[PDB]
From a paper:
We have applied ENM and ensemble refinement approaches to extract the dynamic information from the experimental structure of [name], a PLP (pyridoxal 5′ phosphate)-dependent methionine γ-lyase from [name], which is encoded by the calicheamicin biosynthetic gene cluster. Calicheamicin γ1I is a prototype of the 10-membered enediyne family of antibiotics that contains a characteristic bicyclo[7.3.1]tridecadiynene core. Among the putative genes responsible for sulfur transfer during calicheamicin biosynthesis, the corresponding gene product [name] was recently confirmed to show methionine γ lyase activity. However, the contribution of this enzymatic activity to calicheamicin thiosugar and/or trisulfide formation remains unknown.
Numbering used by the authors:
A (entry chain B): 3 to 380
B (entry chain C): 3 to 381
C (entry chain A), D (entry chain D): 4 to 379
Write the structure that this text describes.
């Protein structure tokens, strides 16, 4: 019923009987007295925790979904979902997914899962990939990182469901403020809440948001058995960051747009990548599925060695991760995509001098000035 | 370098040598090894703490000031500043200050401090009040609560300084995002950080921000001896909330303006108080010293008992405090100003049907709809 | 450093500049590259100094070169099991923790062969270790809730002749009472949720070991599976760890008092405790455990177990163990309820078997609560 | 319940509905008024359940009806002192904590009469309590760093004839070892920063008392001066409290061992410890303290204190006390540095007087570190 910004503040904000705490108290207890529960629901912290459930309820509400489950990290959420793929079955994804996701694909392949990478940006590429026998899961990360191409969630989902397959979107990049995979036709939204959801670079976490009750049971059973559960204090921090998610994302987007214009005016910048550009190859898909184009920007630096440029920022921080209040810069070839061969990177279109920006909430003019200073050198 | 929104994120964000943490680690240690420091700076947690210091550096930076000191609560910040006034000396304040401030005034009065209240909104009231002998401190809270009247900080500061007095502004209401007391000529900005600065209703804290080094030494000596220091985990929470202060405040103000228009349109609303209204009795001062008119709104409800109105809200929370992400509603006569007598409230213009809103960051249309449903109800 | 000193100072990394005695809590998920001489901190899932300090402390308690912590005991166990290939064999006992058995089932659905055996007799051991492609021998000792014991040194000897890794789930005893690595095992496994953190306010797991290749594999899996604990959680475990020896010794001393109370009760039948002189593996307990632990179980004779549970006013009725608060449960109604009555009888878990987890309350208060509850 | 049980369960309020054994941490500053059966919780500075639970625990350790906790020990002290009116007189000892003297100085500038006395002699007492408008008698026992002791029961008797309130700053001993209220005092004052929280990771203070009028004044002051602790801090103090008794007894046991080491060292002169038979007030120690504490001091004869301080590799050289980590300091160089050398001379604080605060490390490790330092 409540709109999105209200859901961020009040979703899962369960009342405290007797005392009336507006902010729910933090449930750190690992164990529970059984005899004084009218309807015994709480037994042991790995299985049940009120603070964790409140965060879950909040996240589910952001997508008007019945279910969410949180995890110790984004990788743990992914690993859980992927554990449901059985020997002989096939997962179709794209060869530009997050390295952590690809690492889990590798493990799945050890366990008799056929991993099929595909181009999911053309009708022919989609058609080919989705014809795989025993197709169990289609894995969409959109926008992709660091080239920021997109995949038509609704179209891939329609075609995947004709094959009986489950569709997950890793929605970490966009956050539910900007993109709603379940509304688009997908079955699962996957997040690293470590990024923009928690938003303050001070907690690790993951989440799955979905509607299927059978999936829910399998996911909860796996979390309980594998024990990849987040702590109560961590859930408190994720929940606390969540209040400002909409305000932060919109600030980040507005600034990214400013930085994109700076970049397009620089003599030492080549190609600029941003989902919001009108010449973006999938601009129509961007317009149809994203309420705004996001806070990640990438560009080809032409002024010399990228590693020298990285040392010149005095406001952007050089490091990995994204979505936080502090603006970050990295060079994928030297950092996030370093474990790949130079050949694989060239094949992926990731040039040695491609630079990636994760825009924080600092003043846009300070960020633009820092960027311009770095680019000009001297 | 650093404009305001940048200072919120990076003010006091000291590098971690060796490990390189972007978010500085939380220093919970009460105790320090003497032999492990090049120069002996850290001795004991009550006196020194890096996490507390980082918060202070951030706060000072928001007003481009050399000094800040944080406290276990806003009351503690106020108590510290007040402790500097000697018996036989006089504090001049507005009649409508925070009850906690008045509680501190009463406490000081029993030590021999003279407390004089005055109308600081008129040139005659200012001239009268500042003519009190032994004037040591002029205490300005603006806008006031719950009537949202406004005092000209620059003007009162110019006159107070001619009398050699220190000027403090309780700037909790506006936050440094909207009002800069030191730039307006005051000597000290006082904050309850419990409110908008931390902003998530999950930690108590206070702060003083100022420029005078002698004041700095006196303030720190008192905090150390009185022991009204905040914990490191609390400073961490305040600092974390600070990141989004400007985004929060601007959302809150934009929604407050929306709610003000809903109130004005309602046939069961009498007076509406908001510093942004053209007919606000101090509109010119508001325009001169506040960058936006804030997120507190108050109004007289005409449609029946205040209690019945309060029962009808389903999004606004009925409680005290303000500045947080959750929207709050209160009836001063029944809640915050309940200690005063009925006669005292009348004298102060706080009527039984005066309602106060503290606007949060929820969707403006959800908040507007909740308010309208409440106004239109009748049981 | 001796044991008690290692609890306080293990992993207590100096704060250069400031001199913090208690190391500051590193909550940052991300790291500036240019601020490190030679960069070793990149991202919180991979690296975190607070987590590393806890790991260094834990490793120190067993004089071992390595430790890795996890979001839970289950996650530590899952990590170790992930190194067993389909077709290969894990040998364990049928009375292993239900969570461990849940993980065995998960592994078995990937094609891991799980064989259960009697590891308390030479013939049972010989038959178990005869399994081809034996990769891992999983020892939980003492067992719960009957408190039987497996000879770690003897089983490890035989297992190593077959080239197998040996892990001991040492949660029950803690490293204060039992040192699996010194006894010959390859890995100590812990739910730090229990006695290690000790205050029932944080979930966590740990593996402690000496093999460098194992180390690389365990870390690679934790990074990829993402089953990492939070920094604030590591702080709570580390903080609880300071008093582990003091807590355990209080708990054992009280457990011993409660055992004699139970043996004197006309409404109590069999009493189980690793320290009783007629315990069937008494020789092994003595050679293997410096003290017999803080868990007690007994057969209640005085009426329905639910009514017994309803009569405690100091013991708390709930699961978990090892904490400062004393807990009581009835396995048939609680921990082992998901079993059939037939399976429980075969395991020797009677309908009126009661289990106590002794906390650090005054022993006289606990003894009086117990007697009052028993109503003998 | 008995003492060790009170540490674990004192203030351990039921979580209705959910059943949390460890109570959840109440961080909310504000409360919904319509959701309360009868409005008790309005605002965090005035009311907070986590804080109240800690207060309930602390009161219970002295079988007292009231306790109030503060942001620090100084804040508790400041609160109690605010109740003394200008023109009234506080009597204290010449050697109280420097923070207490700072508060005395603040009070003296408000017009309070401060009088220092020897509360060790019957003459020093009778002279002190003859002060005209005597409102408060301030006892710190044992004293720091010479560890002299004042008879609480005797001073309290005489002070009560004069109608004065009596407080004991009982930080040194903790409620495990000394019960000021049972001894006849009106208030127990604590820095909970020290042994009560016990892990050197939180600041706090507490007052424990029985008088309802005092209770109202104390709460009105705290609410107005706003010297309130945070919820997370109260959680940490409360969590540390569980093990207070176990820790204190470990510390005392080790202190006795260190005292024996000191007595046999040729570079040690006088040794101060309340448990020594030669202690000038040993009878009073025996009557007032269940054990003689965890603090030891001694004269180092081997040269300047720096020579000794630099050699410790286990003891940490820093201020504070009562924590799990053993600490060493030289009062003249550190805690009592602001004093002139003349003032220290008069107080009997020598330039090479050393003070040990014994933690919970293994006693033989601590003894060895001390001997190594002494030997060079
Ligand atoms: Cl859309
Ligand atoms: Cl008074
Ligand atoms: Cl000044
Ligand atoms: Cl091995
Ligand atoms: Cl259960
Ligand atoms: Cl009294
Ligand atoms: Cl005694």
């Amino acid at each position: 019923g409540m709109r999105f910004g209200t859901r961020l503040v009040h979703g899962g904000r369960r009342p405290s009987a007797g005392t009336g705490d507006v902010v729910p108290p933090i449930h750190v207890s690992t164990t529970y007295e059984r005899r004084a529960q009218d309807e015994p629901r709480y037994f042991y912290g790995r299985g049940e925790n009120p603070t964790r459930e409140e965060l879950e309820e909040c996240l589910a509400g952001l997508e008007r979904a019945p279910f969410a489950t949180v995890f110790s990290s984004g990788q743990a959420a992914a690993a859980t979902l992927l554990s449901l793929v059985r020997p002989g079955q096939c997962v179709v994804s794209t060869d530009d997914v997050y390295a952590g996701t690809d690492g889990l694909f590798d493990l799945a392949a050890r366990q008799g899962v056929r991993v099929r990478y595909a181009d999911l940006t053309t009708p022919e590429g989609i058609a080919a990939a989705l014809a795989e026998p025993d197709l169990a899961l289609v894995w969409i990360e959109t926008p992709t990182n660091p080239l920021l191409t997109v995949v038509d969630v609704a179209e891939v989902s329609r075609r995947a469901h004709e094959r009986g397959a489950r569709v997950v979107v890793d929605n970490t990049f966009a956050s539910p403020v900007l993109q709603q995979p379940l509304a688009l036709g997908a079955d699962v939204s996957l997040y690293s809440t470590t990024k923009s959801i928690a938003g303050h670079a001070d907690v690790l976490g993951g989440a799955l948001v979905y509607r299927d009750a059978d999936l829910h049971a399998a996911v909860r059973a796996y979390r309980t058995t594998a024990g990849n559960v987040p702590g109560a204090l961590d859930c408190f921090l994720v929940r606390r960051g969540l209040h400002t998610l909409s305000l932060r994302v919109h600030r980040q987007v507005a600034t990214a747009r400013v930085l994109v214009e700076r970049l397009r005016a620089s003599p030492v910048v080549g190609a600029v990548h941003y989902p919001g550009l009108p010449e973006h190859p999938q601009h129509a898909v961007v317009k149809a599925q994203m309420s705004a184009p996001g806070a990640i920007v990438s560009f080809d630096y032409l002024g010399g060695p990228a590693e020298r440029l990285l040392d010149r920022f005095t406001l952007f921080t050089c490091g990995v991760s994204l979505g936080g209040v502090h603006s970050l810069v990295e060079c994928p070839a030297l950092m996030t995509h370093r474990p790949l061969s130079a050949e694989a990177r060239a094949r992926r279109g990731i040039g040695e001098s491609l630079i990636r920006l994760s825009v924080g909430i600092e003043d846009p003019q300070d960020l633009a000035e820092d960027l311009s200073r770095a680019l000009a050198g001297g």
